[PDB]
Amino acid sequence: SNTQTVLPFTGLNTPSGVAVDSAGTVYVTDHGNNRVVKLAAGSNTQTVLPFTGLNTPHGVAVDSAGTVYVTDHGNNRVVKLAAGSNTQTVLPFTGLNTPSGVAVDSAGTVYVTDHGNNRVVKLAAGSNTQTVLPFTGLNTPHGVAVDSAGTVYVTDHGNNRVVKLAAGSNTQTVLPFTGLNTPSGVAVDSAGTVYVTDHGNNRVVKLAAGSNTQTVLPFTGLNTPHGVAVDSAGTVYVTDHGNNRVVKLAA
Ligand SMILES: [Cu+2]
Ligand SMILES: [Cu+2]
Ligand SMILES: [Cu+2]
DSSP states (O other), rough: OOOOOEEOOOSSSEEEEEEETTOOOOEEEGGGTTTEEOOOOOOOOOOOOOSSSSSSSEEEETTOOOOOOEETTTEEEEEEETTOOOOEEEOOOOOOOSSSEEEEOOOOOOOOOEEEEEEEEETTTTTTSSSSOOTTTOOOOEEEEEEOOOOEEETTTTTTTTEOOOOTOOOOOOOOOOSSSSEEEEETTOOOOOOEEGGGGTEEEEEEEOOEEEOOOOOOOOOOOOEEEEEETTTTTEGGGGGGGEEEEEO
């Protein structure tokens, strides 16, 4: 499409991550206000999720049960809130330094980019101990996404590239993006198309499934994109750091 919609969030200061659930509810981490806001589909009014003690959130993910998972930079931890709950759970990750992105697969496994430790960690549902994914030579990961097959996609700031690992594989794959500068967020649709916020080039890049054609999505007026999400219809949602807004573009 050639229509971008500014969603009616208010008062954002460095919106850092975005997620969209199956109902079309949009969740945004508002880094500079220590909060996560949500907007139900068609609603005019955001609500603030009742995380307690949250500081400087980066990433957000939502599972099919509606549980919301958030990374907290200032406390170096990951928290989750079940739908309808007022009492978060701190997940049993350990030793995080700048947890930057979070994703949750269909089995409830939680994947977190640990930016300051140059690694991606994962925690199975019910486990108390993370494992480190075998992403050789990873540096400063920002964003993570997991697809319905369990393939994990990660952006690497220091190396300006995007890598993936299939479930059960030891061989990572470097995706055929070109010309990235500070890839931040990543999202993947069920067709396999991969969307990346190319923060240092002020643009959002699409790698079309199959053809591997890279295009720039026709967002307008961005002042450095951070987070990205894509819904089942192919609508792409982006957080715009310098303009303190969240915008969407239909396919
Ligand atoms: Cu931070
Ligand atoms: Cu970085
Ligand atoms: Cu920025």
